[PDB]
Design an enzyme around this catalytic site. Structure first.
Site, PDB file in Angstrom:
ATOM      1  CG  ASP A 143      -9.004  90.207 -36.182  1.00  0.00           C
ATOM      2  OD1 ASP A 143      -8.709  90.587 -37.337  1.00  0.00           O
ATOM      3  OD2 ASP A 143      -8.266  89.448 -35.515  1.00  0.00           O
ATOM      4  NE  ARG A 147      -6.162  87.630 -38.471  1.00  0.00           N
ATOM      5  CZ  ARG A 147      -6.238  88.537 -39.441  1.00  0.00           C
ATOM      6  NH1 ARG A 147      -6.027  88.193 -40.704  1.00  0.00           N
ATOM      7  NH2 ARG A 147      -6.527  89.799 -39.149  1.00  0.00           N
ATOM      8  CG  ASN A 148      -9.871  85.672 -35.937  1.00  0.00           C
ATOM      9  OD1 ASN A 148      -9.166  84.988 -35.192  1.00  0.00           O
ATOM     10  ND2 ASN A 148      -9.639  86.962 -36.155  1.00  0.00           N
ATOM     11  CG  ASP A 164     -11.235  87.446 -31.863  1.00  0.00           C
ATOM     12  OD1 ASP A 164     -10.041  87.261 -32.191  1.00  0.00           O
ATOM     13  OD2 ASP A 164     -11.709  88.583 -31.654  1.00  0.00           O
TER      14      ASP A 164
HETATM   15  C1  LIG Z   1      -9.336  80.459 -29.137  1.00  0.00           C
HETATM   16  C2  LIG Z   1     -10.527  79.643 -29.588  1.00  0.00           C
HETATM   17  C3  LIG Z   1     -10.305  78.322 -30.295  1.00  0.00           C
HETATM   18  C4  LIG Z   1     -11.502  77.514 -30.726  1.00  0.00           C
HETATM   19  C5  LIG Z   1     -11.342  76.206 -31.457  1.00  0.00           C
HETATM   20  C6  LIG Z   1     -10.293  75.837 -32.259  1.00  0.00           C
HETATM   21  C7  LIG Z   1     -10.592  74.583 -32.733  1.00  0.00           C
HETATM   22  N1  LIG Z   1      -9.851  73.751 -33.620  1.00  0.00           N
HETATM   23  C8  LIG Z   1      -8.492  73.980 -34.013  1.00  0.00           C
HETATM   24  O1  LIG Z   1      -7.853  74.923 -33.615  1.00  0.00           O
HETATM   25  C9  LIG Z   1      -7.895  72.988 -35.006  1.00  0.00           C
HETATM   26  C10 LIG Z   1      -8.720  71.793 -35.416  1.00  0.00           C
HETATM   27  C11 LIG Z   1      -8.175  70.798 -36.416  1.00  0.00           C
HETATM   28  C12 LIG Z   1      -6.808  70.994 -37.022  1.00  0.00           C
HETATM   29  C13 LIG Z   1      -6.276  70.001 -38.042  1.00  0.00           C
HETATM   30  N2  LIG Z   1      -6.604  70.435 -39.228  1.00  0.00           N
HETATM   31  C14 LIG Z   1      -7.866  70.138 -39.647  1.00  0.00           C
HETATM   32  C15 LIG Z   1      -7.958  68.890 -40.496  1.00  0.00           C
HETATM   33  N3  LIG Z   1      -7.043  68.868 -41.489  1.00  0.00           N
HETATM   34  C16 LIG Z   1      -7.117  67.765 -42.150  1.00  0.00           C
HETATM   35  C17 LIG Z   1      -5.790  69.060 -41.008  1.00  0.00           C
HETATM   36  C18 LIG Z   1      -5.676  70.344 -40.211  1.00  0.00           C
HETATM   37  C19 LIG Z   1      -5.987  72.210 -36.619  1.00  0.00           C
HETATM   38  C20 LIG Z   1      -6.529  73.207 -35.614  1.00  0.00           C
HETATM   39  N4  LIG Z   1     -11.790  74.228 -32.247  1.00  0.00           N
HETATM   40  N5  LIG Z   1     -12.268  75.241 -31.449  1.00  0.00           N
HETATM   41  C21 LIG Z   1     -12.912  78.007 -30.492  1.00  0.00           C
HETATM   42  C22 LIG Z   1     -13.132  79.325 -29.782  1.00  0.00           C
HETATM   43  C23 LIG Z   1     -11.939  80.137 -29.348  1.00  0.00           C
HETATM   44  N6  LIG Z   1     -12.171  81.366 -28.680  1.00  0.00           N
HETATM   45  C24 LIG Z   1     -13.025  82.332 -29.275  1.00  0.00           C
HETATM   46  O2  LIG Z   1     -13.541  82.108 -30.353  1.00  0.00           O
HETATM   47  N7  LIG Z   1     -13.203  83.551 -28.559  1.00  0.00           N
HETATM   48  C25 LIG Z   1     -14.049  84.587 -29.016  1.00  0.00           C
HETATM   49  C26 LIG Z   1     -15.084  84.479 -29.927  1.00  0.00           C
HETATM   50  C27 LIG Z   1     -15.662  85.704 -30.055  1.00  0.00           C
HETATM   51  C28 LIG Z   1     -16.821  86.051 -30.962  1.00  0.00           C
HETATM   52  C29 LIG Z   1     -16.658  87.469 -31.445  1.00  0.00           C
HETATM   53  C30 LIG Z   1     -18.097  85.935 -30.165  1.00  0.00           C
HETATM   54  O3  LIG Z   1     -15.014  86.566 -29.234  1.00  0.00           O
HETATM   55  N8  LIG Z   1     -14.012  85.862 -28.580  1.00  0.00           N
END
Ligand SMILES: Cc1cc(-c2cc(NC(=O)c3ccc(CN4CCN(C)CC4)cc3)[nH]n2)ccc1NC(=O)Nc1cc(C(C)C)on1
Length: 285
Positions: A143, A147-148, A164
């Site tokens: 995927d 978005r990921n 992801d």
């Molecule tokens: C599930 C999830 C969320 C995060 C995450 C989200 C944020 N951050 C946010 O979601 C976020 C941060 C800031 C803002 C605000 N914005 C930014 C600044 N702008 C100014 C405004 C908007 C909105 C959302 N950090 N870490 C990190 C890891 C995972 N899980 C995985 O990746 N699992 C995997 C991976 C794999 C690979 C194949 C090995 O296989 N499975």
């Protein structure tokens, strides 16, 4: 799941650092994913497991932590630890203050310099670097999409990383899938290559939906008949040629991520590429 058998045999729960729940504070929602803090400080993202869940979700939750923890690369999001001995269960993850790449591209479009061509190439290079690492370790993402992808921060010096969010017939991300994937359910490293091509299009279109005026079924018939997207507006030829290479009908004819990475790097060495101006919107359209 095609990854569970290998991860389970080659990774232990003991490899996961259990953090006492008392030392975890949730600060705010992000999208369930919260910004959290570990102290008693560390800034983290926190994925939660709903207490009302199946024993399959329990497995899925554990396996996510085990799979992420098996990787060690700067362009792949880290697993910081877990808190599985308290309800609701937590997975502690690398906090990416930049948010998801798709939202970043849309919100940072040049409006009457927010972004330059080199910035896009660096993002593409970052993700390509992570994909090479995954390929080298025989992991199939399935995927790859904007978005990921996550960003460490919005300003210069930002680093893009592969993650992801797990959102994946009506549910298949057909617009990111090669023919053998959505016709036969075949997934290989070369199907990730195809997806990366679509990701490149997302990046250089500055966050547009792929196949803009097409539904999933229309894309299905379009692609199977040999149809391919046009270049994003102002997209340099050398960049578009990477995309079209990623979209070769037969997986044998698609490049691996080592080659993709080389070709992206070559683009950054070309002044004619990196001095190309990104399009500007104009509100009234
Ligand atoms: C599930 C999830 C969320 C995060 C995450 C989200 C944020 N951050 C946010 O979601 C976020 C941060 C800031 C803002 C605000 N914005 C930014 C600044 N702008 C100014 C405004 C908007 C909105 C959302 N950090 N870490 C990190 C890891 C995972 N899980 C995985 O990746 N699992 C995997 C991976 C794999 C690979 C194949 C090995 O296989 N499975």
């Amino acid at each position: 799941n095609p990854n569970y058998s290998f991860a389970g045999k080659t990774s232990s729960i003991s490899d996961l650092k259990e953090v006492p729940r008392k030392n975890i504070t949730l600060i705010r929602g992000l999208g369930e994913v919260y910004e959290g803090q570990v102290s008693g400080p560390l800034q983290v993202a926190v994925k939660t497991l709903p207490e009302v869940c199946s024993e399959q979700d329990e497995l899925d939750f554990l396996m996510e932590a085990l799979i992420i923890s098996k990787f060690n690369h700067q362009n792949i999001v880290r697993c910081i630890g877990v808190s599985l001995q308290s309800l609701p269960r937590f997975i502690l993850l690398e906090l990416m203050a930049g948010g998801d790449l798709k939202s970043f591209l849309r919100e940072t479009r040049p409006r009457p310099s927010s972004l330059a061509m080199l910035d896009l190439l660096h993002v593409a290079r970052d993700i390509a670097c992570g994909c090479q690492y995954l390929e080298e370790n025989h992991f199939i993402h399935r995927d790859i999409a904007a978005r990921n992808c996550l960003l460490t921060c919005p300003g210069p010096g930002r680093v893009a990383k592969i993650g992801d969010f797990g959102m994946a017939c009506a549910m298949l991300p057909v617009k990111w899938m090669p023919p053998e994937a959505f016709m036969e359910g075949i997934f290989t490293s070369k199907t990730d290559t195809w997806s990366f091509g679509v990701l490149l299009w997302e990046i250089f279109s500055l966050g547009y939906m792929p196949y803009p005026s097409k539904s999933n079924q229309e894309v299905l018939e379009f692609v199977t008949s040999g149809g391919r997207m046009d270049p994003p507006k102002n997209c340099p030829g050398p960049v578009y040629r990477i995309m079209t290479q990623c979209w070769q009908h037969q997986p044998e004819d698609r490049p691996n991520f080592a080659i993709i990475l080389e070709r992206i790097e070559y683009c950054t060495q070309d002044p004619d590429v990196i001095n190309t101006a990104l399009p500007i919107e104009y509100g009234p359209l």
